[PDB]
Design a binder for this molecule. Structure first.
Ligand SMILES: [Ca+2]
Ligand SMILES: [Ca+2]
Lengths: 236, 239
DNA sequence: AAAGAATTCTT
DNA sequence: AAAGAATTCTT
């Protein structure tokens, strides 16, 4: 399937190539920094041609946002299945050596409002996948004949393709910017889909009614157990 | 000086090189995106060796943050004069085609707390420079390339302009962001950023304004929302 | 504008 | 944890 092929292609490109710098049209290369700010940009760029290659091979047209501040990174869809769009987001985090966690987008935009900050209305998508990259964190300019001399910036890099609701956790990924938090676990649990929600509807419901601060949550629900007791009582 | 040489260096580099893609140790090149999230990263990496050469010429040690949410991008200091450090931050914005604006960092962090989210206590910095890049967004690749196709890789910008200017000099009186409490710059033509045609009387005034600026309109309504109101707040007795 | 989206990290 | 830091943008 598109999905199986996509993750094979990503996993494979990852195994075969090591990004080591930025290059200019004149052939001047500048090394890369070791922060997620840099690496996430690089990992997104590394992924783009792979995504487009696999999608085309499956007849899906790929679309990226025209406006900055819009979800998702890539919207795929064959013209015959307009209401069966698939949203793919690229997420990154790091490790110093170990469990990981990702921020999974806002819980106050498109999930609460069909057209809010999303390329196509929320209800036209049938899948929201997360291409997650994890790297172990590790001054001159170079020439092409120096490609392997350039110090690389990451010790390892792992990639997975998993459904968003599936790796979604019950605690906010960030405060002031209201992000959904992932599960906090080892890489394996993301690949295996060992999350906390039983269904995509439970994920959506939980985050569509999650309150912004502990103050509030303390009277409704803060975690999954409390949310289920909250559901049990009648949303009481 | 360090400053003039740095500015000199940046202009020449930006003039000599057009960044076009990321390269892997194996020679495969991936094109760049044309959004600020990408370009800002590209611009910073482009500046770093240069900032480093120049700093070396003038006997300055360059230090970058160890943690990820720390100001500034680069801290320069003579080993002999640790308390006369220079903070250099790289900011980026674009022109769709013209007046521009930048976001100049938090107004609730290190400026309100000597050690909040800053590599070295704020009081150890004697200057805070901003290297600003402005690129025109290309109206308009998902292919990869090889070392011999450099010229065919499409560039994510029509034009790029860079300047070095003090932070206070280009600061404005309206927030650069809401929820993330950022200082906003003057909304003006590139020329004014280069020429330092700002709004504050001094750096002392810049800092005081941003240190006493309220987070949301409601709050600001009983204090000040602009430079005139701040000047009036001052007269009233910071009352 | 003022407020709140877009991404991820740290104390 | 939470809450709020790092950046830039949209309306
Ligand atoms: Ca996205
Ligand atoms: Ca993107």
């Amino acid at each position: 399937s598109l999905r199986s092929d996509l993750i094979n292609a990503l996993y494979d490109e990852n195994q075969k190539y090591d990004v080591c710098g930025i290059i200019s049209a004149e052939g001047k290369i500048y090394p890369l920094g070791s922060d997620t700010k840099v690496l996430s940009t690089i990992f997104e760029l590394f992924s783009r041609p792979i995504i487009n290659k696999i999608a085309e091979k499956h007849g899906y047209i790929v679309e990226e946002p025209k406006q900055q501040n819009h979800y998702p990174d890539f919207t795929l869809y064959k013209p015959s299945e307009p209401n069966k769009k698939i949203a793919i987001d690229i997420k990154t985090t790091y490790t110093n050596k170990e469990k990981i966690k990702f921020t999974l987008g806002g819980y106050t935009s498109f999930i609460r409002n069909n057209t809010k900050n999303i390329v196509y209305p929320f209800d036209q998508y049938i899948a929201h996948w997360i291409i997650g990259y994890v790297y172990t964190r590790v001054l001159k300019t170079y020439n092409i004949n120096e490609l392997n001399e350039i110090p690389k910036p990451y010790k390892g890099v792992k990639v997975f393709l998993q459904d968003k609701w599936v790796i979604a956790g019950d605690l906010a990924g960030s405060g002031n910017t209201t992000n959904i938090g992932s599960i906090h676990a080892h890489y394996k649990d993301f690949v295996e889909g060992k999350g906390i929600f039983d269904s995509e509807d439970e994920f959506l419901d939980y985050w569509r009614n999650y309150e912004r601060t502990s103050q509030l949550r303390n009277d409704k629900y803060n975690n999954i157990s409390e949310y289920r007791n909250w559901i049990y009582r009648g949303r009481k």
